Amino acid sequence: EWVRKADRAAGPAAVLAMATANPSNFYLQSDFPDFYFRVTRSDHMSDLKEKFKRICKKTTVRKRHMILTEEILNKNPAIADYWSPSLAARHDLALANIPQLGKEAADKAIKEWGQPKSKITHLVFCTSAGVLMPGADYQLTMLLGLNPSISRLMLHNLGCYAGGTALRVAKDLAENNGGARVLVVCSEANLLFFRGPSETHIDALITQSLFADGAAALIVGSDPDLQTESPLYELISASQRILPESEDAIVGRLTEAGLVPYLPKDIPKLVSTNIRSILEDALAPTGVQDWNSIFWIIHPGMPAILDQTEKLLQLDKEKLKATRHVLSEFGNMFSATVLFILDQLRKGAVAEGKSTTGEGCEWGVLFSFGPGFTVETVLLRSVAT
Amino acid sequence: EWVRKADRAAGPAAVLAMATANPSNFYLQSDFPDFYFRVTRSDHMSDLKEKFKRICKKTTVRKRHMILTEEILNKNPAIADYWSPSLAARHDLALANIPQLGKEAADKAIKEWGQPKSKITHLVFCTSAGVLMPGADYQLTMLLGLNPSISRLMLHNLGCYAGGTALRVAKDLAENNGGARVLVVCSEANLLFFRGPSETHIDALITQSLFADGAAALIVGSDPDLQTESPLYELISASQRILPESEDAIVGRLTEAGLVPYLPKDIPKLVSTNIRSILEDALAPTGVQDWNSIFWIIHPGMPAILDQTEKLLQLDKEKLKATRHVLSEFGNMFSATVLFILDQLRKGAVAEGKSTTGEGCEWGVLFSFGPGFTVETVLLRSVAT
């Protein structure tokens, strides 16, 4: 069967531009334990400091960018406390930083896109760094001077899987509206999760070794004008799933002291048990049987999950090179991380001179996860270079 | 031009079922000032009590349903304080009430729909009553036993306009996915806004006279099976807009004591200045020139806006009957209110025996507003009864 266009778009949603941004301030992971235990004014609990240095090394993280400097923490000592009333102070930092960080990435993505920002018709904006009313989707619309009649979707506090959510949402917006151009911005920071240490709570300590700050911006649209627009990826399918027997695996309670995490269940084992059937469900319409003929983007929120997935599917240990690079160079930037990885993978494909934006492969899978236990899966199709 | 279906849907998104729910506990507005100033243990500030009784009368509200009973407030005295650390306690109440309230409305809407809940493929869930990780979208999916692979969109703290946002989102989900059935649930409560009085802050006092609790649930899908499904409305267009010169008109800061509002600009004057051009922009593809030949749903967050819009467009004073009924009987239930009004309008059209679900008219406009200053506009088309 066939129907007229009317107002809808013909082809699948395509990623037409991507860019990233980070706060200028960064910390090297080798220096972080000394800095962390100093500024949280917690040098005495030396056994925990030794635990943190062991934890920090096995993250395989090299540096992380952070809004929170020593001076800012000194002007907001409640943030450095393990648990003190500090939500308003964190949200004042989110208001001064999160939309601005999203604008730095968006400006670069619009620069690569090359079209007037007046053609942007939708904005999807995700952050777990601060609940603002009006949201950072509004603040960005004002800072960027986007059209006042843009269709916005503000996604607060979905957690680490919201990178895939943002693509899943943009896919339906672009494909159902002719001429629609969707600005996608995940702007993330540890502003709600940062806190001092306590031997009573080690879940919080592990999160202090990984979470970092950064923004990723994308332009998504269907039916590209192939003269002025150059697609990088095609969004072919996008799905969400709650894993069986995963109740309360990842829980973040928003309190007077910010976001406090809770992680009872063994997350690597949940992913390992379910990863294969999810992936071959996503690959079902492609005709791919060898898992090494596709490109890969896995949310590196737990580095062990990269290792066990690599060995379980017997991946070529260069398949996750882009994923491990972003992890090492930036840490876990919440929902932005998998879009950082999509960008690094694109740049490395161009750099090393492969035939496709997907490192020489045609098909690729993007896989992120978070509270639920929730998995977002996106099937991507590369573009010849 | 024409394209094949593939996986997309043919026709416009239609509302196929709606239902509402409220907490059992309610307060009559005539009794509220005495109850409010007693339980906030603020009887001494008698001048403010007289202000509150004047404010409460001109709301035209008769009763409001509230999770917060006298006993619950007594077990959480920080909530009754004007400004005390109480976010965790409010969020514990949201976890015990908001998904459950959404399930009461959803069950009724699924009952009217008549199809197996296994055919629900998407869930859109809006609330400003509590930021939960995982969200109330997840909790509802578990309580309802919906498919683990449902595509969810959790919308936290958009404010009062999220009723139109939820329809705008559901429209693209239903129209771009063949066979998709979208459960839409706005479950709202004053859990983050309730607090005691302070003569220093009268914006907070006015909000205490209007905000109330309730949930609305809808089934939205394109291409109805006209044997087993009966459309109630068609979602023809859905747009969002930031009003000019409205910076910081409605602001809600999420603090250690919950949500505190701030309302400097004159909201009735912003709406009055812009209402007509927005409405005739929405009506542009219909061919309607007389504003009394369409049915009406206006978010009654400020009752004065109903009066000034009525007189500005010289409406028949029965056009807003459904809108004023929900206001009087339930108060301002945040994003759920305009869906309550859509339901009341449908029921009254059937009751009084009109020819269309839109009170005998063909076209109708749904109009809600919130932080931005943001306006959501939905063009609806009724169905013969």
Side-chain angles (χ1 to χ4, degrees), chain A residues 2-3 5 8-10 91 133 138 148 152 156 168 172-173 175-177 240 242 252 254 372 374, chain B residues 2-3 5 8-10 91 133 138 148 152 156 168 172 175-177 240 242 252 254 372 374:
Chain A
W2 302 68
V3 298
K5 298 291 99 180
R8 88 192 71 196
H91 274 168
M133 297 184 38
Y138 162 79
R152 301 170 274 128
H156 281 119
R168 170 162 59 83
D172 278 331
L173 300 186
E175 288 177 1
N176 198 57
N177 298 272
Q240 192 186 46
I242 307 167
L254 184 48
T374 289
Chain B
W2 302 68
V3 298
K5 298 291 99 180
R8 88 192 71 196
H91 274 168
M133 297 184 38
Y138 162 79
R152 301 170 274 128
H156 281 119
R168 170 162 59 83
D172 278 331
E175 288 177 1
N176 198 57
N177 298 272
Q240 192 186 46
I242 307 167
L254 184 48
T374 289

Side-chain angles (χ1 to χ4, degrees), chain A residues 110-158:
Chain A
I110 290 159
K111 184 74 172 64
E112 170 184 31
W113 183 36
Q115 305 313 295
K117 59 182 157 198
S118 186
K119 290 178 179 179
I120 293 167
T121 61
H122 299 70
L123 171 64
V124 180
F125 181 10
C126 308
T127 186
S128 290
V131 184
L132 308 167
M133 297 184 38
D137 68 310
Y138 162 79
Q139 316 286 346
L140 177 62
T141 295
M142 300 298 273
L143 290 174
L144 265 175
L146 298 177
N147 298 334
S149 64
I150 186 169
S151 297
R152 301 170 274 128
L153 194 71
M154 175 75 236
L155 303 183
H156 281 119
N157 292 83
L158 277 52

Side-chain angles (χ1 to χ4, degrees), chain A residues 87, chain B residues 83-84 86-87 90 191-193 195 253-260:
Chain A
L87 190 63
Chain B
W83 206 84
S84 290
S86 47
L87 190 63
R90 303 169 181 272
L191 291 180
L192 290 187
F193 277 93
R195 69 196 62 256
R253 300 298 171 204
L254 184 48
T255 73
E256 306 95 319
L259 271 177
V260 177

Side-chain angles (χ1 to χ4, degrees), chain B residues 88-109:
Chain B
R90 303 169 181 272
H91 274 168
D92 282 318
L93 280 167
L95 175 67
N97 286 287
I98 285 306
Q100 298 79 358
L101 188 63
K103 180 187 179 289
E104 305 179 34
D107 277 332
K108 293 196 220 168

Side-chain angles (χ1 to χ4, degrees), chain B residues 32 36-37 40 45 48 51-52 55-56 59 64 66 79-83 90 190 192-211 251-253 255 257-264 302 334:
Chain B
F32 193 73
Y36 175 71
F37 274 87
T40 61
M45 59 191 76
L48 208 53
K51 289 191 194 301
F52 194 52
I55 283 163
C56 283
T59 59
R64 288 179 285 158
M66 299 203 177
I79 300 184
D81 287 338
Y82 169 70
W83 206 84
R90 303 169 181 272
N190 62 17
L192 290 187
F193 277 93
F194 186 91
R195 69 196 62 256
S198 180
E199 60 268 348
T200 69
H201 199 190
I202 315 294
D203 279 338
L205 195 74
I206 279 153
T207 66
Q208 302 309 314
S209 67
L210 285 153
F211 287 144
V251 160
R253 300 298 171 204
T255 73
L259 271 177
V260 177
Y262 298 110
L263 283 160
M302 284 201 156
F334 305 82

Side-chain angles (χ1 to χ4, degrees), chain A residues 26-146:
Chain A
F26 64 91
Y27 301 114
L28 288 182
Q29 189 79 311
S30 53
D31 305 326
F32 193 73
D34 289 334
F35 160 78
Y36 175 71
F37 274 87
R38 171 170 83 248
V39 306
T40 61
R41 67 198 185 277
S42 304
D43 284 290
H44 54 282
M45 59 191 76
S46 315
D47 318 303
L48 208 53
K49 193 170 180 167
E50 281 303 321
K51 289 191 194 301
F52 194 52
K53 291 182 72 66
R54 277 176 272 256
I55 283 163
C56 283
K57 293 182 181 189
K58 293 289 95 177
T59 59
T60 74
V61 173
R62 191 184 72 81
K63 78 175 161 52
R64 288 179 285 158
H65 295 255
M66 299 203 177
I67 292 156
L68 294 174
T69 63
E70 205 163 353
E71 169 182 17
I72 296 177
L73 287 172
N74 274 347
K75 284 185 68 184
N76 298 273
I79 300 184
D81 287 338
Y82 169 70
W83 206 84
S84 290
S86 47
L87 190 63
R90 303 169 181 272
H91 274 168
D92 282 318
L93 280 167
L95 175 67
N97 286 287
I98 285 306
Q100 298 79 358
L101 188 63
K103 180 187 179 289
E104 305 179 34
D107 277 332
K108 293 196 220 168
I110 290 159
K111 184 74 172 64
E112 170 184 31
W113 183 36
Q115 305 313 295
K117 59 182 157 198
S118 186
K119 290 178 179 179
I120 293 167
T121 61
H122 299 70
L123 171 64
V124 180
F125 181 10
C126 308
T127 186
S128 290
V131 184
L132 308 167
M133 297 184 38
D137 68 310
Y138 162 79
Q139 316 286 346
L140 177 62
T141 295
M142 300 298 273
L143 290 174
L144 265 175
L146 298 177

Side-chain angles (χ1 to χ4, degrees), chain B residues 106-156:
Chain B
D107 277 332
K108 293 196 220 168
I110 290 159
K111 184 74 172 64
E112 170 184 31
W113 183 36
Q115 305 313 295
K117 59 182 157 198
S118 186
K119 290 178 179 179
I120 293 167
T121 61
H122 299 70
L123 171 64
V124 180
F125 181 10
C126 308
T127 186
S128 290
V131 184
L132 308 167
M133 297 184 38
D137 68 310
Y138 162 79
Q139 316 286 346
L140 177 62
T141 295
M142 300 298 273
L143 290 174
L144 265 175
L146 298 177
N147 298 334
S149 64
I150 186 169
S151 297
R152 301 170 274 128
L153 194 71
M154 175 75 236
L155 303 183
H156 281 119

